[PDB]
C-alpha cells in the first residue's frame, strides 16, 4: 500500500492545525512509528477507522493551482498556501476557476501599471495568477460575446474585497482607454461604509 517507511503524513496538533511527520517503519494492517521535527521519535495511535492524510510530493507543492496537488485535503491546501505566501510572497492563488486572494497587510509593487499591459491578452493559464488575470477573463469574454460579465468577491470585510475591486477597476480603466469613474467610486466608498457598515463581535467595520 502507499504507506511505507520514508513517507510523510499529516498529524493533528492543537497548536498548529496540522503537523508534518515521517513514517519510520512501513505500515502493515494498529500503531505507527512516527518521526517528527518535535523530537526525533513518537508513537501515534490509529483510531477505530482512520489513516492520516498522506503528503503530496514536492514537485506539486507550491504550484500556482491547488488542483495541481495530487492529494487534495485541508493539510495540503493549508501548507501550499502558507508556502506560497510566506516563502515566495505570492498572495494570489487558483482553485478550479476561483481565484483565492490572501491579503498581505504590507503594500506590494505588483499592482503597478506595466503589469496591466503584461497580463493583457494573455489567456488565463498562460500567466501566473493575479487579479488582472480575472479582470481580463471578464473583459475578454465581454468583448468576445454579447454577455455581460460579473466578478463576485467574498470574505470577512477586513480581508480586502474593496482593494480587489479597486484594482480590477484600474485594470478596466487602463485597458479601456480613459474618465473619473474610479475616483468617484472610491470617493463614494466612505459614504457607503458610514451608512452601511457596522461593528460586530468578531470584527470592527
Amino acid at each position: 500500500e502507499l504507506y511505507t517507511k520514508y513517507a510523510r503524513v499529516w498529524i493533528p496538533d492543537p497548536e498548529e492545525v496540522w503537523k508534518s511527520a515521517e513514517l519510520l517503519k512501513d505500515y502493515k494492517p494498529k500503531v505507527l512509528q512516527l518521526r517528527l521535527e518535535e523530537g526525533k521519535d513518537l508513537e501515534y495511535c490509529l483510531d477505530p477507522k482512520e489513516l492520516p492524510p498522506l503528503r503530496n510530493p514536492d514537485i506539486l507543492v507550491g504550484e500556482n493551482d491547488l488542483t495541481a496537488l495530487s492529494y487534495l485535503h485541508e493539510p495540503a491546501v493549508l501548507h501550499n498556501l502558507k508556502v506560497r505566501f510566506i516563502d515566495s510572497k505570492l498572495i494570489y492563488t487558483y482553485c478550479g476557476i476561483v481565484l483565492v486572494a490572501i491579503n498581505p497587510y504590507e503594500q506590494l509593487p505588483i499592482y503597478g501599471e506595466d503589469i496591466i499591459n503584461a497580463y493583457s491578452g494573455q489567456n488565463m493559464g498562460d500567466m501566473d495568477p493575479h487579479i488582472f488575470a480575472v479582470a481580463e477573463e471578464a473583459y475578454k469574454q465581454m468583448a468576445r460575446d454579447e454577455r455581460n460579465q460579473s466578478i463576485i468577491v467574498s470574505g470577512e470585510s477586513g480581508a480586502g474585497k474593496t482593494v480587489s475591486a479597486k484594482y480590477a477597476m484600474r485594470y478596466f480603466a487602463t485597458v479601456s482607454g480613459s474618465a473619473n469613474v474610479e475616483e468617484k467610486v472610491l470617493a463614494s466608498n466612505p459614504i457607503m461604509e458610514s451608512i452601511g457598515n457596522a461593528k460586530t463581535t468578531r470584527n470592527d467595520n
Binding site: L2, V17, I59, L78, F85, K89, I102, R147, S150, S164
Partner: protein
C-alpha cells in the same frame, strides 16, 4: 435574478492573521476563513472527480524514466495509453481524453512515488558500483 443574467467569475479573500501583521500566517485563522469561503468544500467536490489533467507529451517526458525502449513507439499517445493501462490496474481510476489524460486523486502521486523508488534503487546500484570500482582500484594501488 441579476447574477443569473450574467456569467460569473469568483474571488475569495482570506485574512491571514488576526492582528494585521504584515505577513504572519496563522493556520487556525486561515483554516476558519477557508471553510467560511467554501474553498475546502469546493476542493472536496473536485477531489471526487478527475481533478488532475496531463498533456500526453508532458506525461511522456516525465515518465520516460519509467518507460522502456520497447514501449516507446511511433505514436506517443498510443504509447502512453499502453504504459498507463499497464501501470494503473483499475481503468476506473483514469480516462483518456483526446489530448489529455485524466486521473483521480492520488494517481499522479502514485506514479511519482514509483518513479522515485525506481530512480532511487537504480541510483543506489550505480553509486555502489562506482564506489566499489574506485576503492578496488585503490586496493590494487596498495598492492602496487
Amino acid at each position: 435574478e441579476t447574477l443569473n443574467a450574467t456569467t460569473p467569475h469568483y474571488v475569495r479573500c482570506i485574512k491571514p492573521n488576526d492582528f494585521k501583521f504584515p505577513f504572519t500566517f496563522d493556520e487556525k485563522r486561515a483554516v476558519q476563513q477557508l471553510r467560511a469561503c467554501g474553498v475546502l468544500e469546493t476542493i472536496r467536490i473536485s477531489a471526487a472527480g478527475f481533478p488532475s489533467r496531463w498533456t500526453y507529451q508532458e506525461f511522456f517526458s516525465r515518465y520516460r524514466v519509467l518507460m522502456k525502449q520497447k514501449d516507446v513507439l511511433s505514436d506517443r499517445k498510443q504509447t502512453c495509453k499502453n504504459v498507463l493501462e499497464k501501470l494503473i490496474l483499475d481503468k476506473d481510476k483514469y480516462q483518456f481524453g483526446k489530448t489529455k489524460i485524466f486521473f483521480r486523486a492520488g494517481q499522479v502521486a502514485y506514479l511519482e512515488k514509483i518513479r522515485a523508488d525506481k530512480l532511487r534503487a537504480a541510483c543506489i546500484r550505480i553509486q555502489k558500483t562506482i564506489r566499489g570500482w574506485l576503492m578496488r582500484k585503490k586496493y590494487m594501488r596498495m598492492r602496487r
